[PDB]
Write a protein that binds this DNA or RNA. Sequence first.
RNA 1: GGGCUUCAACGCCC
RNA 2: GGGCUUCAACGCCC
Lengths: 211, 218
Amino acid sequence: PPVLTSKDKITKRMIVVLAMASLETHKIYVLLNCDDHQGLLDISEARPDITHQCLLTLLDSPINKAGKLQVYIQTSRGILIEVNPTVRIPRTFKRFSGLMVQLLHKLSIRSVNSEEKLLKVIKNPITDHLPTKCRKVTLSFDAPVIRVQDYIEKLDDDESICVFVGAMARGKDNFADEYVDEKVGLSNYPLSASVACSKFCHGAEDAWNIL
Amino acid sequence: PPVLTSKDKITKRMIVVLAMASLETHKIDKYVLLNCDDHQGLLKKMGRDISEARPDITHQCLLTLLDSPINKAGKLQVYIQTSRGILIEVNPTVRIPRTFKRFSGLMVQLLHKLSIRSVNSEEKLLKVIKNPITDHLPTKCRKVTLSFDAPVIRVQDYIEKLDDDESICVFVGAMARGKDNFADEYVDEKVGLSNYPLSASVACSKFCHGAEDAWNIL
RNA sequence: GGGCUUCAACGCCC
RNA sequence: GGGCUUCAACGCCC
Ligand SMILES: [Mg+2]
């Protein structure tokens, strides 16, 4: 399954961008996070677990395995990361952090052999990296609920779909407003970020006959 | 929205059993859960428990299930089932701890005391219970094992075939690898959910999604 | 140098 | 005793 990148601006893919991601290294370096740095401190700006949670939730999906998914992370401090669909993200937060810390310092994680870059810090904005036919949407409890399967079917045969989800514990849905066409809800109940991710993946897997 | 428990034998509902879960306390003079990060050194020394120490998988799965609409709607209960044969019932309203460190603490305490009690309420949130799982299950309940090597199904379709008074119980192996026979003795069949191997959590979302679709949950 | 791993890097082991 | 928290218990702070 040929790998999706920001260069390919034609192919019809689904893109999820994890926004307000908490990825702030703390000099001692390790990732700043509630557990260890509860005491040191506002806990909300320090929830990298949520990101780590979603990455597993996202890369483990049938849709990524079918390579019609693309993940981006955009932290709460405006750092932008392209995730390579084929990267086998560490399963444990600890190992995750080691890696995440390194990537922030070096700006990219390279495969020990291939020329590919498993993870890369790219320059803003995110609009310069998305496909040219691409619907921009924000997830929000405070919006009209939808069936993900229905929504996906209304897309042009060429139109990709890029959803902005907040990798945060709480807060305003404004984080992507300068980019979005539309904000929508996936549920009557408020969801965790990772759950919102499953919902979309799964609805779109369904829409796209995966698999 | 009435809370579902094993005591109720009639309601139609979806049950997930996280079979083969890796929960084990660790002495050091303090207690923690046996886990591949802290104890990969030790485990190897003693020449075993190679990936028999993946409590995080259970943790992941739990968040994934309880965070799900089908849970919020009260049509889902979960059970755990340990490598070492311990069975846990999980009260559907329990706001499980978000991080693994805080999860560990609580599972270590649950294992030593056999229950976790609400500070104000007298209902338990987690409770160790007696095997077999099949006593605690609804009377009319379809039982299946999720398996990569089993016939693939569309869950929405798989569910609409259930008698209007018949529940569905799914056993997921909460583990990194292994034969999917951790439940051969209870289940009616085994099914696959994808042509790709899944992770336990993903299998779990996939299945919840499916029920949520078919049972009309938003 | 060699290895472990639902965790190329990370995190450990010899 | 009081408090914090997508984490009653847990893990922290006073
Ligand atoms: Mg207290």
